Structure formats: structure tokens, C-alpha cells
Amino acid sequence: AKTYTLTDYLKNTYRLKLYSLRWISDHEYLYKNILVFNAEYGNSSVFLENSTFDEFGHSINDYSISPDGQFILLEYNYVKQWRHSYTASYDIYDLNKRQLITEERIPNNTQWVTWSPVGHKLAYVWNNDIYVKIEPNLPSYRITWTGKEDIIYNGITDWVYEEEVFSAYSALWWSPNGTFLAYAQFNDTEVPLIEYSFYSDESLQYPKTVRVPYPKAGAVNPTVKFFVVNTDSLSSVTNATSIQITAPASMLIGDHYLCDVTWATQERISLQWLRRIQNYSVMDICDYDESSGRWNCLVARQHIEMSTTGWVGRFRPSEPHFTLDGNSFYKIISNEEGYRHICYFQIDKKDCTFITKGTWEVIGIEALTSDYLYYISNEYKGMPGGRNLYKIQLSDYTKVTCLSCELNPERCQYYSVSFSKEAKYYQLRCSGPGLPLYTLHSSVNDKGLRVLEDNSALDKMLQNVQMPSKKLDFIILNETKFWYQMILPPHFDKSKKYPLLLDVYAGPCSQKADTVFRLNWATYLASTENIIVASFDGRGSGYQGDKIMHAINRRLGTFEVEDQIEAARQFSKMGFVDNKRIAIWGWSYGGYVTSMVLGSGSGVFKCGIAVAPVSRWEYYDSVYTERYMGLPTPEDNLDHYRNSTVMSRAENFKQVEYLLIHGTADDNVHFQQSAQISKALVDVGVDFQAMWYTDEDHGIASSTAHQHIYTHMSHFIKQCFSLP
């Protein structure tokens, strides 16, 4: 008789239980007490007691066991930087001796730490330089002497590489047996700085000015170098010698990126490079030479990947999966029909043969063994929004087994997977449409060992609450399927008219209509406020082939915007939608599209909310922006850069109720972007509503800020919909 309230969402009354494991062998894995588990039986017992480090003094944020299990690294003093980057203090614990190591310790304010893949070698980054420890208690060797704050990054990424290329702070790649440590070096000397105020605590008298080298569209980019150093032959008397691997000649002719690093074998590494115009990428295969101690990347072994219709990869070229001998690999590339499928490449020839095909896409290669290739795709039922684990037989490609399709077809249609070190076991994670379900399997016969978490605890509670449902479906548009989803209020009556809120992202390769179960803001709006919240994947959206995804190439703020308006038009004709009460909201790219929609003059939407929106593409970073827009120069794409601003649509905002929200310490979509929107609206005399968030960044993710923002939006929406 009670509903899922805003408070329920904000305080997580109804917790979604996870089951996070970290494999350590081919049949064992860890689980947070921190106990070990057996995939076979489930026996053993404990690894570390709930409070053995009670007498540490500091509060432990995370742990990391060495591969051989002889040492555990303890992380504390965590200071977040950007999305993936941060700073921490570290101590190492000898698991055998049962004592904290106190000689030659890892320094304070360490940027990144990593074990070698086998054994207990250690590499860390401090003050933008790389250090190596053969043994946890011996003096570390300094690898690099060039690291300078905001200027040179050794073994760590700068702003743009962090956010837009590697989705990681780390730029260190150990060879499979720990012999070689490969790293990248970024140079930002000439990359312009973004500056913004950070007000900080009330005690701070004068505001701090934050500075980060951040390349906006068409600006000077960071340059990148790639090195490889031999850790087995490290000298405590002479400096470490780093062999450089230069980019291919087809890359060195202009600005370029390093977009992938993947070790093939103990003495072979693959590198992928991307031109600044992101429609051409090359893969180098580099072997270690013992006569010279150098690395050779045969020009004949280069593999080219390009696109005539758009950019390469979903957000970057796919990563290769090497056969053990490293003379072959599989990777996802789009076929001649434009659908992303798995291609098999032989190291010493031009042609690859495709091993999957059809009008659906492979999402990822999960593991490869001697006999089988494992991958997740949206093939099941032609639904782009589902995800199932498949097995393909290497000796015969037509022999394909769906390992998750029928495990529970009603409650489970969206899977991810985690395989053991050698793929003998795998954990399946099901994310919807029913409550999440975590199961454990043996890959020898593909039967299920046991249920790891079934979420019945949560299921019991949701029995008493009036919950919304999800409709997943498509509309036909120009002889093409476009998918949408709806969070429908409980006791849904299709003869009554409901206010509708369009929830938008709609960036390139986005997908907002899927089979995932979520407890979120939409959930409360549906449950308590009886609002329908819909999402739509129009042109530019992903996992439906290049025809749809590349439709907005060089033309951002066009078709994907038009299609959201059309979706709304379509939902009005569904009969149960009150077309005097349609609203639209989105974050980031979604804030942009919401703003573009509201300023289009369509008359379809009464109101909207844009959170941290891009307002004009020259303000956003090069890597993301240029992938879709090219350069903002007269000989490239300036005209569309100038045409696709939200500012230029300010006059049409007179027709709608607008709320614009932005965190003042947004390193990503700079406050600048909203500042220019508000200025344009003021300049044409449009009244609207605003909210800044002091020192909040792109996430607006502080516990209190998070609560304030969703509360503020609730009132705005409820006000727009005449809801008390």
C-alpha cells in the first residue's frame, strides 16, 4: 500500500545486493571480513579477520594481494582527483611473517601502484615518475627522472587520456611473467590550462585557483611516447635503460594518440595508434630482439583499421585477444554491413576472416581458450538491449552455444561475466529485467555450481511496496526499428492520461533502452508521482550497427535531437500520455540534447532540466569532440560547430520552463558551458531557473549535494506537472 519514495532512493532503503569476487587462481577467489572461497566446493575459511589491522591507526580504503599471495598491499589516505585518478598512502604486509614492512616504504601521495602479474614485483608512480621494487623491503629503482607536475606524466595519464582514452589513471603494462614493464609518457607542456575557482571549506579566506592542462576542441594536444624497460636486469648502480617504441610512420606525420596497449606473449607486444582525425588507426606488433635489446615492429605486420562513414571503434579501436603462441588474435571490428563482429587475424598476412555475423553485435570478447572463444552479444531475440554469454567452437564456427539465454529467460536477459584465471570457472551476473542474480559455473560442462546471491532479501521488501514496471519495445521510423523503454507507474491504466518525462543521454554509442533493473530517480517518479519516464535510442545510438551509430557523424546536435522530439510525438499518439505535460531531462550529453530540444521550438515539451550540459563543442575536450565533429576550422567543420550551439537557440526558450544546473568545480564540462547558456538567455530576456553547486564536479556526487539536486529537480518537475 506504500510507494517507493524520493527518500527511499536517497537513503537506499532498498539495497541492491551485489556479489563482488576477485579471482586469485583458476579455482579460488576472494570475497569481502575478507574470506577465501573455492569454486569447486566452497570450503577453506578466512584470509584476514575483520579487525587484525585494528592496530594500524589509519582506516583501510582498499587492499591488494600479490599474485603469489605472499604480500598484501594496504591503501589508505585516499584523496580523489578526477574520475579514475587519485592519491594514497601505502603499506605492505608480509603475510607469512605477519608484520607490516617498515624499511624502504612506499611514499605518501603515491599516484598509482601495481603488482607484477606473477610473483611479488612492484611498480609505483610518485610525483609523475616510475619506481620499481623487486622485493617489498628492498630499495626501489627509479625508472624515470623527467616527471613534472602538470607537464610530464610517466606511467600515469593526463586529464584527457584519463577521461577519454584509457578510462584509467594507470599507464603501466607488465608483460605476462613480469619480466618487462611497459609504460607511456605524456607531454602537456603546450596544452592550455583550464582554470576555475575552488572555494573549499568556510575557513579558506581566499579561493584556490585550480589548473589542469585540458585540450579543448582544435587546441594543442598532449604528445605521447612509449617505452619498455627490463626489470630483471635492473642495476642499483647505473640508471635503468628504457627502450622506446616509436609510433608508425603513418602516425608520426601529424597529431595522433596511443589508444591501446596489449601484451601478446613474453616477448611480443601490440600497440594501437589513432590519428587525431579518428577514422584511421594502426596496430603495431613489436617483438623483443636479444642481439640488440631493442624492439622491432615489422612494417609488414601492421594492421590497419579504418572507417569511411565515421570514427574507428565504439569509443576507440577494440582490444586484441591473442592465441597463446601470439601468432593470431581475435578482435571486434565492423563488417561490410557495418555490424560489429569478431574477426580472426593471422599475424603474418593481410586478410582476417569473420567468425560471427548477422544483424546484431558482439559487445566484447570475454575469454579465449585452446578450444573455445567466449563473447557477450545482443543476438538473443534481435533485442539490442539484452546481453547474453555465448560460446563459439574454434574448430567449427557454426557451432555456437548460448550459455545464458535459457538459464532463466523471464527474469534474466542482461548478463556480464567473470572468468577464472584460466577460464575453468565463470561467475555470471544478471542485471535484469528481474532482480540481479549472481551464479557460479564450471566451464568444463557449463552446468551451474550454485547461486551466489539471489536478492530474495530485497525481494521480500518489494512485496509490500507498489512498484513500477518497465516496458521495452520499439517504434518503426523510415523502415527502421528504434528502441524505447518506459518506467510505468503501478496499476497502470491505459485509458488514463499520464504526464511523461523523457530521460535522455543520446550521445554517440549510447543505449538508454535496455533490459536492466534499476532503483533510481525514475523509480520514485513512477511509483510515488505517477509520472511515466521514457527513454529513446534514436540515431547515433549504439549496438545496432554503423548505419545508425554513424548517422550523426560530423553533425552533432541534429538527428539525435530531432529523434527525441519524434519519440515524444510518437508517445503522444500512444493514447495514455497527457500531451500538455511532457518534460525532458538529461546529464552531460543529455543536458546538451535536452537544451537543444527545449530551444528547437517544437512546442512538444512544457519544461526541462539540463544538468552540466555541453553548450558549444569548442568548449569540450578534443578526444571526445573531434571523434564526432572533426576540427573547428574553416577547412574542416567550423560551420557546424557554429550551428550546433545551445546559445543560438535562446530565443525559443521563451516557449518553455527551464532549469539549468551545474557544479562549479566541474573539471569535465566546465561551469563555463552553463555560464554562457545563462548569459545568452539573459541577453534575450528569457526567464528560467538555475542552481549552481559549490565545489561539486561532473558527478555532483557528494552525499549532501546528490540529495539536494534530486530534491530540487523533484520540486521543479512536480511544479511543472501541477502535482501537489
Ligand X SMILES: N#Cc1ccccc1Cn1c(N2CCC[C@@H](N)C2)nc2ccccc2c1=O
Ligand Y SMILES: *[C@@H]1O[C@H](CO)[C@@H](O)[C@H](O)[C@H]1NC(C)=O
Ligand Z SMILES: *[C@@H]1O[C@H](CO)[C@@H](O[C@@H]2O[C@H](CO)[C@@H](O)[C@H](O)[C@H]2NC(C)=O)[C@H](O)[C@H]1NC(C)=O
- 268 forms part of the interface with a copy of itself (CB under 8 A): no
Catalytic residue check, 666: yes
For residue 8, which of 609, 528, 701 has the smallest C-alpha distance? 528
- 154 forms part of the interface with ligand Z (CB under 6 A): no
Query: Among 535, 588, 594, 622, which residue sits at the site for ligand X (rule: CB under 6 A)?
Result: 588
Site track 70-109 with ligand Y (rule: CB under 6 A), x = hit: -------------------x---------------x-xx-
Catalytic residue check, 563: no
List Cα–Cα distances, 651 to 249, 586, 644, 647, 680, in angstroms: 50, 21, 15, 9, 9
Catalytic residue check, 459: no
Closest CB 62 distance from ligand X, rounded Å:
21
Catalytic hit among 503, 666, 667, 697: 666
Q: What is the 3-state secondary structure (H, E, C) of 87-156?
A: EEEEEEEECCCCEECCCCCCCCCEEEEEECCCCCCEEEEECCEEEEECCCCCCCEECCCCCECCCEEECE
C-beta of residue 165 within 8 angstroms of C-beta of residue 316: yes
Closest CB 503 distance from ligand X, rounded Å:
10
Nearer to ligand Y (CB atom), residue 435 or residue 629 = 629
List Cα–Cα distances, 642 to 295, 534, 645, 648, in angstroms: 46, 31, 6, 9
**d(C-alpha 262, C-alpha 326), whole Å:** 11
Query: Among 279, 335, 466, 672, which residue sits at the site for ligand Y (rule: CB under 6 A)?
Result: 279
Helix H or strand E encompassing 488: strand 481-488
Nearer to ligand Z (CB atom), residue 187 or residue 318 = 187
Query: Among 2, 22, 211, 494, which residue sits at the site for ligand X (rule: CB under 6 A)?
Result: 211
- 597 forms part of the interface with ligand X (CB under 6 A): no
Question: Segment near ligand X (CB under 6 A), from 440-448, 453-461, 566-574, 587-595?
Answer: 587-595
Catalytic hit among 303, 441, 662, 698: 698
- 12 forms part of the interface with a copy of itself (CB under 8 A): no
- 219 forms part of the interface with ligand Z (CB under 6 A): no
Residues 385, 386, 391, 395, CA torsion sign: negative
Closest CB 534 distance from ligand Y, rounded Å:
34
Dihedral pair phi/psi, residue 711, rounded to 5°: -65, -45
Closest CB 612 distance from ligand X, rounded Å:
7
- 176 forms part of the interface with a copy of itself (CB under 8 A): no
- 359 forms part of the interface with ligand Z (CB under 6 A): no
In the region spanning residues 200 to 239, those forming contacts with a copy of itself, defined by CB under 8 A, are 202, 205-207, 209, 216, 219
- What does 179 bind: ligand X, ligand Y, ligand Z, none (CB cut-off 5 to 8 Å by kind)? ligand Y
Nearer to a copy of itself (CB atom), residue 451 or residue 684 = 684
**d(C-alpha 357, C-alpha 332), whole Å:** 11
- 224 forms part of the interface with ligand X (CB under 6 A): no
- What does 42 bind: ligand Y, a copy of itself, ligand Z, none (CB cut-off 5 to 8 Å by kind)? none
- Which residue matches cell numbers 535531437? 561
Q: Judging by DSSP bridges, how do beta strands 437-442 and 425-430 pair with one another?
A: antiparallel
C-beta of residue 82 within 8 angstroms of C-beta of residue 667: yes
Q: b/e per residue, 349-371, with b = 16+ CB within 10 A?
A: eeebeebbeeebbbbbbbbbbee
3-class SS at 676?
helix
For residue 163, which of 221, 82, 225, 226 has the smallest C-alpha distance? 82
Helix %, strand %, coil % of the chain (to 5): 15, 35, 45
Query: Among 192, 448, 601, 603, which residue sits at the site for a copy of itself (rule: CB under 8 A)?
Result: 192
In the region spanning residues 280 to 299, those forming contacts with ligand Y, defined by CB under 6 A, are 280
Closest CB 247 distance from ligand Y, rounded Å:
17
Helix H or strand E encompassing 397: strand 396-402
**d(C-alpha 322, C-alpha 261), whole Å:** 13
Q: Please tell me the count of residues contacting ligand Z according to CB under 6 A.
A: 5
3-class SS at 264?
coil
Nearer to ligand Z (CB atom), residue 16 or residue 220 = 220
Query: Among 30, 151, 168, 277, which residue sits at the site for ligand Y (rule: CB under 6 A)?
Result: 277
- 221 forms part of the interface with ligand Z (CB under 6 A): no
Backbone interruptions in the chain following residues (C to N > 2.5 Å): 32
Residues that bind ligand X in the complex, under the rule CB under 6 A:
149-150, 163-164, 198, 208, 210-212, 315, 505, 507, 587-590, 614, 620, 624, 665, 668-669
Residues that bind ligand Y in the complex, under the rule CB under 6 A:
38, 41, 43-44, 89, 105, 107-108, 145, 177, 179, 239, 266-267, 277, 279-280, 306, 308, 630
